[PDB]
Homo-oligomer: A and B are copies of this chain.
Amino acid sequence: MDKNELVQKAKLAEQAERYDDMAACMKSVTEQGAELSNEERNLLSVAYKNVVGARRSSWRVVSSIEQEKKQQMAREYREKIETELRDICNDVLSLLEKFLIPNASQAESKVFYLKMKGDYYRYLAEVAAGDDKKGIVDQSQQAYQEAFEISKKEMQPTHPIRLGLALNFSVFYYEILNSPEKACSLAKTAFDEAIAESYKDSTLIMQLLRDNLTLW
């Protein structure tokens, strides 16, 4: 196989904007004997986020466009995309749970993929249908809810992986769980201590969550 030739490829692909080839090469490198160097880790993080992101965006728009006869095609078009969505998330939610989380014996990485898991189940949670919805909205809670606690006993708020979490896990409430009180709370909180107390990354995350309470 040659592990670092696939890394060598995922670099090139990204530097070529065609992001599927990119997630493929990484999907590969992780379905190897994991413990993805942060580099690879992000590459993977970036690539997969681009595809599933690409789908979300398209899904959103098309839902509103749908949600008439034009509508059934809107529907048909939606499902087509939802699928593509689901298969991407089903795909990354694998590597995470089956290679990543268990092949990252370090706190940093621990809290990370636990966001990712949550991030993805969350996407799967928007796009849902019946009780499967509840099944996946819950699977996301626990996953987000497991590193918040992990970040919490292993490293600081002024660190972007935790701050970030707070943001996203905070948002897990508005868009998803319907607990604005908890979202806002979590955001005021994780923002709060952030201030208490390298440079940029934190700062950035730090604003966005505020920017967010400005909404809620």
A-side residues, CB < 8 A to B, are: 5, 8-9, 12-13, 15-18, 54, 57-58, 61-62, 65, 70, 73-74, 77, 81
Contact = CB atoms under 8 A, between A and B. Distances in A.
Contact of A73 (B9, B58, B81): B9
The oligomer's copy count stands at 2
Nearest 6 pairs between A and B by C-beta? A16-B58, A16-B62, A18-B58, A16-B61, A17-B58, A8-B70
A12 B77 CA distance: 9
Contact of A12 (B8, B13, B54, B74): B74
B61 A15 contact: yes
A57 B16 CA distance: 8
Contacts of A8: 70, 73
A58 B62 CA distance: 28
Of the candidates A16, A54, A74, A81, the one having the most CB atoms from chain B within 10 angstroms of its own CB is: A16
A78 B17 CA distance: 14
Given A5-B73, A12-B73, A18-B81, 13 more contacts: A8-B70, A12-B62, A12-B74, A12-B77, A13-B77, A15-B61, A15-B65, A16-B58, A16-B61, A16-B62, A16-B77, A17-B57, A18-B58
Contacts of A15: 61, 65
A100 B15 CA distance: 36
8 contacts: A8-B70, A8-B73, A15-B61, A15-B65, A16-B77, A16-B81, A18-B58, A18-B81
Nearest to A55: B18
Contacts of A16: 58, 61-62, 77, 81
B65 A12 contact: yes
A58 B21 CA distance: 12
